[PDB]
Amino acid sequence: SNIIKQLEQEQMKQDVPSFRPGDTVEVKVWVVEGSKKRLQAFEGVVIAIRNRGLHSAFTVRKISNGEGVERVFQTHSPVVDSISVKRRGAVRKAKLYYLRERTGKAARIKERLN
Amino acid sequence: AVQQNKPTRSKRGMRRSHDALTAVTSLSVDKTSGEKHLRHHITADGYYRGRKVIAK
């Protein structure tokens, strides 16, 4: 699969930062409003990350206007511009799917002060 | 579920035409010990490919 590796390698984003499950991440995504392009910020807690090279993706959960929302971002897609870690959280599990059943105080994540 | 007529000897024989066994095509000879054996199997005295694989 060296052919696939070269094809995927040539189009992998290079400025991807380092982030982990449980850290609050803000992602800038291109949104097209007619002819004019625009950027909107989606900020939330990273509850799941899959690393597959070009096919890597991560899931961000946020509560917006009283409704829970989950977005699965393709990290290397051109749609996403930059990733910023506003806060670093310490968790014991790779996947935080249990957060879906909690809200408010029960959903708090302790900060990772390494 | 069960037959309506007794099948004949002929039908019985034809069904058994494919039940015949096949003999081993040939038997390999150990390079040094000299006993005939199945290919890729050790000989009676434990030899294989000219080396005494098994002590017994």
């Binding site: 052919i3 696939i4 094809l7 995927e8 291109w30 096919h55 393709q74 897609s77 051109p78 | -």
Partner: protein, 209 residues
């Protein structure tokens, strides 16, 4: 129009500046050496016999190697034929590469499907499964009735039944050509194609047009 024989390297994702992701099957098309030309005067039809790849010299039968020697070509994986229309001609030993598809918008891909072995009617023919409860006795996913009593007194030919599924030639039509990379002998086609990774693959111009 003449096609080419390639190998299913795998599947990949191609990103576009507009933000759209195109799933592309990567097909490697090495040099296609023509081994024989079929003529009306001798064979009754116009076609070209081609071979691709290489195979170990210890396993090329001189009946096959002699065929390659006749055309002065190195033995390939196998032999395939393509029909010739009125306007195209070729010479024995000519090497054809992936640029032939550089001017082709759509291609036709054929290959052997993945073998599912002995498949039941539910999997093979999308038969509806019967009740899993409510008294059903050993007939949860059985085919059911297969006839209409005495009047026909038989099962009609072509009745859908359990049997071998897959492992057969299949053609997928009207696949967009995303990109042609003649510097690495690769062809990218949108969508999936029959067969597993590394299987022989035949690519032809879209007949449907």
């Amino acid at each position: 129009m003449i096609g080419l024989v390639g190998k299913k390297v795998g599947m990949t994702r191609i990103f576009t500046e507009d933000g759209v992701s195109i799933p592309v099957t990567v097909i490697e098309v090495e040099a296609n050496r023509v081994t024989q030309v079929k003529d009306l005067a001798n064979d009754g039809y116009r076609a070209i016999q081609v071979t691709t790849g290489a195979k170990k010299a210890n396993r090329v039968t001189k009946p096959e190697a002699g065929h390659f020697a006749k055309a002065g070509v190195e033995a390939g994986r196998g032999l395939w034929e393509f029909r010739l229309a009125e306007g195209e001609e070729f010479t024995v030993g000519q090497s054809i590469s992936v640029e032939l598809f550089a001017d082709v918008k759509k291609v036709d891909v054929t290959g052997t499907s993945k073998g599912k072995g002995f498949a039941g009617t539910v999997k093979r023919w999308n038969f509806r499964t019967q009740d899993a409860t409510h008294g059903n006795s050993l007939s949860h996913r059985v085919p059911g009735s297969i006839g209409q009593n005495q009047t026909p007194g038989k099962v009609f030919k072509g009745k859908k039944m359990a049997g071998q599924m897959g492992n057969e030639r299949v053609t997928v039509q009207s696949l967009d050509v995303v990109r042609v990379d003649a510097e690495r002998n690769l062809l990218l086609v949108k969508g999936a194609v029959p067969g597993a990774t590394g299987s022989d693959l035949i690519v032809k111009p879209a007949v449907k047009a």
